[PDB]
């Protein structure tokens, strides 16, 4: 009963100091876990989404929604704790060019979820509006056997909801290019839409 959408509550300033009900904290406090306890919950994502899905494509694009609802949380956290609350800072750049947020995702999102920075970030040289991001080892899909890459898409929805809430409407698609002795190399191609494309030209 604070913001109803029926009205704007009109309340006078400089009232009393009220009681304190719930107080949280926001710094990182780098607390670890075991990769088995992650991979068990990832296979319990997939062991229900195999059950309540009829074809492949809607399984793809509702495994992606779980990653969407981690990406739109994580975008507001990572810049805000990288620019550093009551230890008052000077805030971050709020990046607004497509190869200034790709450097941020490439060097900080993958260094946040995973221990290492992702290795390469490859422009599609022979055309425009495709932007590859690769690694050498997807450490969440690494217990899936076979070759079909539907089980990839929980990480790629983390990418897509990172950009869709950043003002950059895109669409990701993952593929597998087994280059060299890295048999699981697993490119994602970020593929921005047409209606964004004029705006960074002007």
């Amino acid at each position: 009963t604070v913001g109803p959408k029926q009205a704007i509550t009109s309340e006078a300033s400089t009232t009393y100091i009220p009681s304190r009900i719930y107080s949280e904290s926001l710094l990182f406090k780098r607390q670890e876990a075991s990769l088995s306890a992650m991979a068990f919950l990832f296979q319990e994502m997939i062991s229900q989404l195999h059950r309540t899905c009829k074809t492949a494509g809607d399984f793809e694009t509702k495994l992606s929604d779980y990653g969407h609802n981690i990406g739109i949380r994580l975008l507001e956290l990572l810049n805000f704790r990288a620019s550093s609350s009551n230890y008052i800072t000077k805030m971050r750049r709020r990046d607004l060019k497509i190869l200034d947020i790709l450097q941020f995702i490439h060097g900080t999102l993958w260094s946040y979820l995973f221990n290492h920075v992702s290795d390469d970030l490859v422009k599609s040289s022979e055309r425009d509006n495709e932007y590859m991001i690769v690694d050498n080892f997807p450490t969440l899909t690494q217990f899936i056997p076979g070759e079909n890459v539907s089980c990839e898409y929980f990480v790629c929805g983390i990418i897509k909801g990172f950009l869709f809430n950043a003002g950059f409407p895109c669409g990701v698609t993952a593929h597998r290019m087994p280059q060299g002795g890295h048999s699981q190399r697993t490119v994602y191609l970020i593929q921005f839409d047409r209606q964004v494309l004029d705006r960074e030209g002007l």
């Binding site: 009963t1 604070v2 913001g3 109803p4 959408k5 704007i8 509550t9 009109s10 309340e11 006078a12 300033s13 400089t14 009232t15 100091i17 009220p18 009681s19 304190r20 009900i21 719930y22 949280e24 926001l26 609802n69 739109i72 949380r73 975008l75 507001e76 956290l77 810049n79 805000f80 609350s85 009551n86 008052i88 800072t89 000077k90 805030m91 971050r92 750049r93 709020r94 607004l96 809430n165 950043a166 003002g167 705006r199």
Partner: protein, 147 residues
Amino acid sequence: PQYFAIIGKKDNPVYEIEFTNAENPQGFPQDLKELNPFILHASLDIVEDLQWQINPTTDNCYLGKVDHFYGLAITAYISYSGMKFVMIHGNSANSSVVIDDNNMRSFYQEVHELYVKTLMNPFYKITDPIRSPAFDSRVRTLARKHL
């Protein structure tokens, strides 16, 4: 009087407040009913126009007095997801946000910390208002102590 609002992605509001001095207790006399949301929704657009400008009309988070209309200035803050913290200031004479410009930058950062703290609840979707009794005390103690 002061009007403060958090405007969402589709321009749908998620927090909506006014707070004002006790000299004029019924604040914003015949503007709060009929101009005060219109000037907010009308002057979202220059804040939206300023989100893709590198230099204004090397921080790009705080924005100054972006509009001045009948002697009411508004101030803005474009967060990382794009929720914009626009706030209308009203007075008797020509109000100055320049006396609080060093101050209330740490009012926008200290409400953006509260928005990040209420984003992390996984039950909280986007495009629904903040029905939080904790949020009101957490914003009005900040409004009382730091104006």
